[PDB]
Amino acid sequence: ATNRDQESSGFAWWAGNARLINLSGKLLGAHVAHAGLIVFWAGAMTLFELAHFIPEKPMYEQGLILIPHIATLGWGVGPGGEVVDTFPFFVVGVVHLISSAVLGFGGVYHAIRGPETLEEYSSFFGYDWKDKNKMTTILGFHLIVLGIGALLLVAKAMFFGGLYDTWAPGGGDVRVITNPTLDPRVIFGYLLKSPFGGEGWIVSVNNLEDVVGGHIWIGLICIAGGIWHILTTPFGWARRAFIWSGEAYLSYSLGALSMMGFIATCFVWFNNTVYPSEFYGPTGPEASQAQAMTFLIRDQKLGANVGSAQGPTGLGKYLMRSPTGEIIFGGETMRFWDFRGPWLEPLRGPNGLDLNKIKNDIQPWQERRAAEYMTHAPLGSLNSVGGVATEINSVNFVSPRSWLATSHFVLAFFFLVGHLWHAGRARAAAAGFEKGIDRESEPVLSMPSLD
Amino acid sequence: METLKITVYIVVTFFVLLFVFGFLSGDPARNPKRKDLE
Amino acid sequence: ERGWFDILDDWLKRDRFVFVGWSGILLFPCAYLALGGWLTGTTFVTSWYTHGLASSYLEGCNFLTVAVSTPANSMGHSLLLLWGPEAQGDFTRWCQLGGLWTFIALHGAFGLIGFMLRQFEIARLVGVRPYNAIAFSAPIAVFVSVFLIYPLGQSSWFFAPSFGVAAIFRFLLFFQGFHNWTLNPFHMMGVAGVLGGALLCAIHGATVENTLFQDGEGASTFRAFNPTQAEETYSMVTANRFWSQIFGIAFSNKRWLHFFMLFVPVTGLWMSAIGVVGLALNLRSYDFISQEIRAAEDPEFETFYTKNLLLNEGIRAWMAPQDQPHENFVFPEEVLPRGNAL
Amino acid sequence: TTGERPFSDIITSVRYWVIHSITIPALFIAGWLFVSTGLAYDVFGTPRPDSYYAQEQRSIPLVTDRFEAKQQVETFLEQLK
């Protein structure tokens, strides 16, 4: 039992995994088994969702988060996101669940039976954290792998059925992407967009051509970068900038993951393109706007002239101007005027919401959709009672957008905390005082008084 | 307003550059003990 | 001089797993009955006859909504003793009238007396100064002001806090709507003492933990301490320099530091208690007169203070009929205060 | 230490479990029956689901007099036919 107590390893049981830092075989084991756990959850959770799935209720009324991910890719769904075949969901679930067995088998093997260290066994699979070239090489393999992944998304979109497109002419539907956006001004133009209202950085991506082209760029970039890191070793400036240790690299990755988590939170909250409202429910903005729409429709049917209706504050009861003059829905939803969705856009002209189109061209499907979305707003309790906080029990509903956003904020935050922890520790340990101050060499004691 | 904007952009850029080039100026070695961390 | 008193004294102070003491004669039965009353009431006992509420696991409440509720308003400040004139020795009727509320409040009070006497007794036996008991004076001021003096100032025990999670939440909101308690500078000093105390706890713990001397070889550093050691386990000098440079001022005297850690949360709780004594009499910090004069004359003048009062008015009107059933409030819909649409 | 047998000794001994494998389930069953027989309701005076209101009544049985409170509760109870 090499290194499996505090006295020999220096780490207590509650930090026991830190005993693995220089044990590449067992560490490989931990990693592979963990990957196994992830894939296991994907499979099992998918089969659970499918078992509980009623094809004629919206997905979002049923607590689904993975089936929406599958349906977004174009599998199992048809016009307007209606389920036409549940078999691909079944396939996805079963295949992940079976793969998890292979992964776990490997993980357990390397973890308790295989070589505890790999260096003596193989120069190729062996590594020293402090070997910069080897680090950049493994990094490179993994970048090529990620690039390939992005390219698989591309291949699905272009050659194997396409993607679900909430924006398809005539109504949302599955669509093959034939002309992906390759122009770098567009692609990287997203990257330089402000993250504030009406701009929204990369979260603002609103068409699949841009999504797909973006993935072509990321695929090539990752493969190229992978090759670069396989062929090179870090330059002097990098060498002097970073800490080179396992715990350091881990901390860097924790920072990256935290950042990505906050990003995904905002994506699932605001974006209704790669997270179609057909599957995930309406966004908060969307449902608010939809309320406005619903009452405009009702009151106008009653005979109200909604363009000239002055509300109690002096602002339009139904319609008002944005700070730059565009015609928008009034009331509190004035905040959500940057919202865009296929059910609303046919009412939009060059200056914003168009009064003539409003008076003359609103179709029954728009009324239906606005009602649906208004009454599936992402508000609800921890015990999944749908609606505002004061609503009575009756409707069993918490929006998938809320589950995903909240979960990923919690995770992203704790991951920032973890970054601080491991970065600070990595610094202290590399400098040699992570276990405390040397009584015979206390740095402050050799410093001049502050006063 | 435009003069204000350019001014502020320049100030922000200046300090951000100080931050970045500063942390790039051999920071791991700025500690009381083991300095050679390259 | 070895009589029965001294023999009993001997027995009471045996160094056993759970120390007893003379104070234990008061403390143990009273604490046991208070906890037992609460567990008994929240598991089995209703508040149908006192409040018109379900309040027990038996009725379908969960841990957040169970409570031992106060007696009906019509009971006034009756001690509501089981053998008293109200229940007349009838246990079932006593539970239905809210006798468990006063049982728990009173046994709990004597129990807290017992606990502080315990802090004194043990300090005296071991030979340390009695600052722990002294610091415990703040929980006592809080319990006494909130659970006894406050309802004694009001119409009845009904308006005391009921013993339960959600019930306590209701107490908070009631105090906002009726007393504007957040506006009270005594409450505010309480807040400063509680959050300042939490701040001191955190910052002190973290400082000690991050100025430790390396007193062992292990990367887990807890083992490198020995209770009997003479030496400080962390550097006050390094701690001092760090904080002087970070925040501008720092502790330099450990005795003062620890006293301050007593002083801050204890003083905060004491101030909150004083404000609650005022609320016992509806002697509130509800308004700023200058604000009200200006606002009444000028329909364009608006502050966060006036906004909060509109919220309070909403709370009173919408919560009163069900929260104060003995008043038999019937508020027709048309009199209910509401903004547009909602 | 203070003289009493260490807990870890006790709860890892065969005798402890010979006693407590009987005493622990017995207490649990007793508590169950306390509810399942309906005794609890009668002991504490807690309304069963069919005893909060009479069939057509929608007003709470609130106690309104301190010294005749017992009789009021008895009257409320009688009013459930």
Add this chain to the structure above:
Amino acid sequence: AELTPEVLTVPLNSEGKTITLTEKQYLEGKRLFQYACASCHVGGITKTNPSLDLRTETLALATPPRDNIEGLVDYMKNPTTYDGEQEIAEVHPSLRSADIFPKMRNLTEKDLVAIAGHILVEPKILGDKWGGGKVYY
């Protein structure tokens, strides 16, 4: 108080005929109503048009009358405006529009009767709460 057969007895039609729902029917009616209707009609109100509720008095004053089993079943088949003047299947869930309101696709005649029974029985239990909105919460 109990859920008696009397409470569960409601008008079948406008001609004085009544039907008595089983407890299982009552439960089924609550379940199906939550399933297909509560998203808009929780508590007896109507979120997308609060002017019209599900109170028995309101339904009685509808055209054609909607305060009986037949009236309600028909409404779930071919809903109209309050005056009976327009058919609104295109914007309100119904069997007729089960193509665009897919949750109506599996509702059977038995189910519709259960939902109707729910809508009629609930105010006998809850009184003003039913159709009352937040004021009565």
Add this chain to the structure above:
Amino acid sequence: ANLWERFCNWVTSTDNRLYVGWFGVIMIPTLLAATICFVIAFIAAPPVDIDGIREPVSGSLLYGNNIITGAVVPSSNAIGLHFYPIWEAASLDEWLYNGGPYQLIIFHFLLGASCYMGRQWELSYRLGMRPWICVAYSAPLASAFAVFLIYPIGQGSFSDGMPLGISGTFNFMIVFQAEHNILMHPFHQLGVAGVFGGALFCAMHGSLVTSSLIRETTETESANYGYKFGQEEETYNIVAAHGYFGRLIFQYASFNNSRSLHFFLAAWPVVGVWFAALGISTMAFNLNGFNFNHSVIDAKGNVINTWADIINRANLGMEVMHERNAHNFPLDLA
């Protein structure tokens, strides 16, 4: 040494009365800007249309406020999450009417405090200390982010960020309770356990250490003179403190390890406050407190109220009254 090198040596110098550092290089201008703008605005800013309904709210002292009622008022609902720097306004008068000071202050502040945390790391490293004081500070910092940035993001407007003032703080709390039932949320409850617990343990530790101070002084002088800055020996007898506390409860409920004890003092309030922050940050996306409205029902189906329903009535009062002129449609959906 060249100029850049000397500058670097000064910036990172351990000998400055207040440490500067690279994080400090960002912290110092940002915190000054927020501070100066906050002071001027608090005293002299005209009323701000917080809810975008042309209903300006007065926050400043010169415009009819005292210390308790005063605030720097959040930016206009018409603005939402749009970035509204001074140069986006046609004039300062406009900037002021729409609540520009609020955005200037909170953005400079959040950046500056993020840098304050970084700086705590940085100095810990220059001094040869262990690094985690900054992690402790992450708890109040995350909380500020929650109420100044995350909640606005989730709700779609900085108009719903916490106001910079005392009464404005209370307003934010009451509205939050109406809209999320925060009291019935377990993360807020963990927050309360964290701060109540922190105050408790603060008092406890204070009192135990104070109780066990070793006699080094006479009765006519403060016991504090018995400790001298930088002395090597501990100033109280921990074995005695533990002898007391272990007997107050039982032996194995008391800490005998000072390191373990101080770790606990750090962890309890820090974790609790982390959850407080996460409560606000998840309710930001409208995953709210437990809802048991009408959970208890009798045999006929009558609602039997619990304390949860009374809470509900209070919440309704708050809900129907807040922003009395801003809603035109029946549901408040943000």
